RNA sequence: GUAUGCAUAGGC
């Protein structure tokens, strides 16, 4: 039958210089034939590892594997904010060549707190009959954030969708956006359109407001 | 200079067939193991078919077997992977990888693989292939100013955005479509600026939607509020 | 546990 190879954890977040092991198991014997690989989110797999312990040409030395029985370990020796991606190993031994189910490994950097931008919409929008109105947080950290919309003080539930970047390879950060989507009818109905921001980085909430038909 | 290329995914609807290609460079198809391995939406990878072309030798998951057979054309040095009976579930990237055939991966173990291509979306659906609109969000923080586009109602995926034809890239996110409950996408481009920049510097939204043949060169600039003059 | 190159290809 089919070979599993179980990898744990699912998830963990690790602070920068960290040594991080990702684990994984195959349900029978792989006899070494084992690879790891990392992969950024939207992008093809690369190669790290490709017996239980060799190193492919190019990748950094921070980046080991070892084995002992049908236990498998990657090890990165120091943690880079450019280590962010998903982590997977695989089994060459038996077709099908099985992948375990991946590791995101998150980077964790200081508290840093969200720079909130409001935007009103379009002109062009408007004779189309919807009005979208979007809700900028800015590379902001740890991920967790709220937006709720208020038209003239009242909240605004189900007519909303956000979506949240990976985090940056770089500085760390995240950043979100949220679209608050109207009928331009119930849009020219209302004056007040605000977006409230909770966020650990902001001491208190955060709001920014715009007003019908102000400039 | 050792690269694959895959071709020919897009929208189908359930039960349709679909013929991906995987186009290879820089080296002859037969001197490698041709894999491919797909991912759903949010989904681990999974390794589906491969073949050696040169023994000819292929083997299917099980998820995709007897529905799925890979073929290989020397003459056009391309790997070719014929969905058939697609369901809602083979809806997915579709990356086409290798390994080198060398002593090393017959008599011992390296057999990871190596070179990859960029990957191909497949969507399995009954809905209608339809362009984006593309809108302005205007700036109006501290010395930063953010603008960006809204890239509304399209289907299927993907957008891509760039701003200014490439040359502006620091300062950007585009954030992860998002499906809304008409069943088309939606997405944001944005750009953070220094706000002394916006008399000067133009900036413009490119957008592509491939599937419905949309290009469009959105520019972007603060409204003025002026009704005097 | 070493050559992600070659090669009747089970060898170099």
């Known amino acids: 039958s089919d070979i599993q190879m179980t990898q744990s954890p699912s998830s963990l977040s690790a602070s920068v210089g960290d040594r991080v092991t990702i684990t994984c198991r195959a349900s029978?014997?792989?006899?070494?034939?084992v690879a790891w690989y990392q992969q950024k989110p939207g992008k093809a797999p690369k190669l790290l590892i490709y017996?239980?312990?060799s190193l492919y040409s190019g990748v950094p030395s921070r980046f080991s594997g070892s084995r002992s029985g049908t236990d498998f370990t990657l090890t990165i020796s120091s943690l880079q904010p450019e280590d962010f991606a998903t982590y997977y190993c695989?089994?060459?031994?038996?077709?099908?060549?099985?992948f375990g189910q991946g590791t995101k490994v998150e980077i964790k950097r200081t508290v840093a707190a969200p720079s909130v931008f409001i935007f009103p919409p379009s002109d062009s929008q408007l004779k189309s009959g919807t009005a979208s109105v979007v809700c900028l947080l800015n590379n902001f950290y740890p991920r967790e954030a709220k937006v709720q919309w208020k038209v003239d003080n009242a909240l605004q539930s189900g007519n909303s969708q956000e979506s949240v970047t990976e985090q940056d390879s770089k500085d760390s950060t995240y950043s979100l956006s949220s679209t608050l989507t109207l009928s331009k009818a119930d849009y020219e109905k209302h004056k007040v359109y605000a977006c409230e921001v909770t966020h650990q980085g902001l001491s208190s909430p955060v709001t920014k407001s715009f007003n019908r038909g102000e400039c | 200079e050792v690269q694959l290329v895959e071709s020919g995914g897009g929208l189908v609807q359930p039960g349709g067939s679909l013929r991906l290609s995987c186009a290879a460079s820089?080296?002859?198809?037969?001197?490698?193991?041709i894999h491919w391995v797909r991912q759903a939406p949010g989904k681990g990878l999974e390794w589906v078919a491969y073949?050696?072309?040169?023994?000819?030798?292929?083997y299917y998951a099980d998820s995709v077997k007897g529905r799925f057979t890979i073929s290989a054309d020397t003459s056009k040095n391309t790997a070719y992977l014929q969905m058939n009976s697609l369901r809602a579930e083979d809806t997915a990237v579709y990356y086409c990888?290798?390994?080198?055939?060398?002593?090393?991966?017959?008599?011992?173990?390296?057999?990871?693989?190596?070179?990859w291509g960029q990957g191909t979306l497949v969507t399995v659906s009954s809905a209608s292939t339809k362009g984006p609109s593309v809108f302005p969000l205007a700036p109006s923080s501290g010395g930063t100013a953010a603008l960006g586009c809204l890239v509304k109602d399209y289907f299927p995926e993907p957008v891509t955005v760039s701003w200014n034809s490439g040359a502006l890239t620091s300062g950007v996110h585009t954030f992860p479509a998002v499906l809304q409950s008409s069943g088309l996408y939606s997405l944001s481009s944005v750009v953070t600026v220094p706000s002394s920049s916006l008399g000067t510097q133009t900036y413009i939204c490119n957008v592509n939607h491939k599937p419905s043949n949309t290009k469009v060169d959105k520019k972007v600039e603060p409204k003025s509020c002026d009704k005097t003059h």
């Open positions: 820089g080296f002859s198809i037969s001197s490698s193991y």
């Open positions: 029978q014997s792989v006899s070494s034939a």
């Open positions: 073949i050696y072309p040169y023994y000819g030798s292929t």
């Open positions: 695989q089994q060459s031994y038996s077709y099908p060549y099985t």
């Open positions: 990888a290798r390994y080198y055939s060398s002593g090393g991966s017959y008599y011992r173990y390296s057999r990871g693989f190596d070179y």
């Open positions: 017996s239980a312990s």
